[PDB]
Amino acid sequence: EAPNQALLRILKETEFKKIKVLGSGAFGTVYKGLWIPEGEKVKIPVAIKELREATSPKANKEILDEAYVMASVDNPHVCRLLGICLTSTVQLITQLMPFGCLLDYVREHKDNIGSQYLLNWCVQIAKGMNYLEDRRLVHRDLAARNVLVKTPQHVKITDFGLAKLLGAEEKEYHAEGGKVPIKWMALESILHRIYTHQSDVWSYGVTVWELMTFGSKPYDGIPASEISSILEKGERLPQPPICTIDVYMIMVKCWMIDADSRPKFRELIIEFSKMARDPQRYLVIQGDERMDEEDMDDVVDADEYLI
Ligand SMILES: */C=C\C(=O)N[C@H]1C=C(C)c2c(-c3cnc4ccccc4c3)c3c(N)ncnc3n2C1
């Protein structure tokens, strides 16, 4: 394989100002704040993320593994690691995405989201995933909760805690035990713990279903242990109301038993771009046609602060 020359930036604690808490949950604890690289008259809004646990050595081992992957990606639809802060438990720093995750976004703004925005997000998520496929990255946890919203018109993929790099001739990742989002992974992943770029496509299919249902829960009700038996009977997630058969067929295609028969990310880009050019022909939404701080002089988004 090729040598990974990504730069792992280490950030002084004195460089972070106005750290205010952003959220807490299974993702740990996330903070909003400002990163002021010393000297540079720039104030970059950031998000800081640690662990809702203890300075357990194993926690830092997995933190620094997500750091390794996120430090190695550079794409307009993938979140990049700005750096890490070497406190007791390692903190991961990234660009602040002010509108939060796409999952909570579609849930809160159901009555104001048009087909244009929906289809555009589908293009953008597939562009980031296609980039990850170029970098030989199996995300292994694609889901609406793991897509951040910079602006309503610009979303990016995040959360690399399960991501794995495949070898130059390695085609699959065989895993071991551990909590996995079963309602998002392909059948072969649940049965044989096999992960590929085509299993990520299955996860993409569920993620798209999440957007078209405006944030519904996949297999709402069914416990996790029945999913494998349900998918083996041939059952899949239902057609969302706003979804034409054209769109729902793309979802179904992501859920083929044959992983190689599922669409490739580069194709999902093409198909959704076509649909995004006439969005009302493919999504039917009622009313579609009709759908901080005093430190700002030197604020610069992370996308405009380059090495
Ligand atoms: C979708 C549901 C949800 O509750 N999202 C919140 C939690 C997260 C993790 C988050 C981040 C975020 C994601 N990934 C990172 C990787 C390394 C370092 C830091 C992060 C932070 C986030 C960001 N970056 N901006 C805005 N809101 C964010 N949330 C909310």
From Swiss-Prot:
According to the record, mutating L8A results in: Abolishes phosphorylation
In the UniProt annotation, what is the result of changing Y305F? 50% decrease in interaction with PIK3C2B. 65% decrease in interaction with PIK3C2B. Abolishes interaction with PIK3C2B
Active site positions, chain numbering: D141 (proton acceptor)
Question: N6-(2-hydroxyisobutyryl)lysine (modified residue): where?
Answer: K49
Q: Where is this site: Important for interaction with PIK3C2B?
A: Y305
Q: What is the effect of changing R281A?
A: Reduced phosphorylation
Q: In which tissues is it expressed?
A: Ubiquitously expressed. Isoform 2 is also expressed in ovarian cancers.
Substituting G177E results in: Found in a lung cancer sample
Consequence of changing L165Q: Found in a lung cancer sample; constitutively activated kinase with higher levels of basal autophosphorylation; more sensitive to gefitinib than wild-type
> In UniProt terms, what is the effect of altering E38K?
Found in a lung cancer sample
Effect of changing G28S: reported as: Found in a lung cancer sample
Tell me the ranges covered by the Protein kinase domain, including all copies. 16-283
Q: What is the effect of changing G23D?
A: Found in a lung cancer sample
Per the UniProt entry, the effect of L51F is:
Found in a lung cancer sample
Swapping S72I leads to an effect described as: Found in a lung cancer sample; constitutively activated kinase with higher levels of basal autophosphorylation; more sensitive to gefitinib than wild-type
Q: Where in the cell is it found?
A: Cell membrane; Endoplasmic reticulum membrane; Golgi apparatus membrane; Nucleus membrane
Q: What is the effect of changing T94M?
A: Found in a lung cancer sample; increased kinase activity
- Glycyl lysine isopeptide (Lys-Gly) (interchain with G-Cter in ubiquitin) crosslink site(s): K20, K41, K58, K61, K171, K233, K264, K274
* Function as written in the Swiss-Prot or TrEMBL entry: Receptor tyrosine kinase binding ligands of the EGF family and activating several signaling cascades to convert extracellular cues into appropriate cellular responses. Known ligands include EGF, TGFA/TGF-alpha, AREG, epigen/EPGN, BTC/betacellulin, epiregulin/EREG and HBEGF/heparin-binding EGF. Ligand binding triggers receptor homo- and/or heterodimerization and autophosphorylation on key cytoplasmic residues. The phosphorylated receptor recruits adapter proteins like GRB2 which in turn activates complex downstream signaling cascades. Isoform 2 may act as an antagonist of EGF action.
Subunit structure, interactors included? Binding of the ligand triggers homo- and/or heterodimerization of the receptor triggering its autophosphorylation. Heterodimer with ERBB2. Forms a complex with CCDC88A/GIV (via SH2-like regions) and GNAI3 which leads to enhanced EGFR signaling and triggering of cell migration; binding to CCDC88A requires autophosphorylation of the EGFR C-terminal region, and ligand stimulation is required for recruitment of GNAI3 to the complex. Interacts with ERRFI1; inhibits dimerization of the kinase domain and autophosphorylation. Part of a complex with ERBB2 and either PIK3C2A or PIK3C2B.
Q: Which disease is it linked to?
A: Lung cancer: A common malignancy affecting tissues of the lung. The most common form of lung cancer is non-small cell lung cancer (NSCLC) that can be divided into 3 major histologic subtypes: squamous cell carcinoma, adenocarcinoma, and large cell lung cancer. NSCLC is often diagnosed at an advanced stage and has a poor prognosis.
In the record, the note on similarity to other proteins reads: Belongs to the protein kinase superfamily. Tyr protein kinase family. EGF receptor subfamily.
What is the name attached to this protein's record?
Answer: Epidermal growth factor receptor
Q: Which organism is it from?
A: Homo sapiens
Q: Which residues of the full protein are shown?
A: 697 to 1018 of 1210
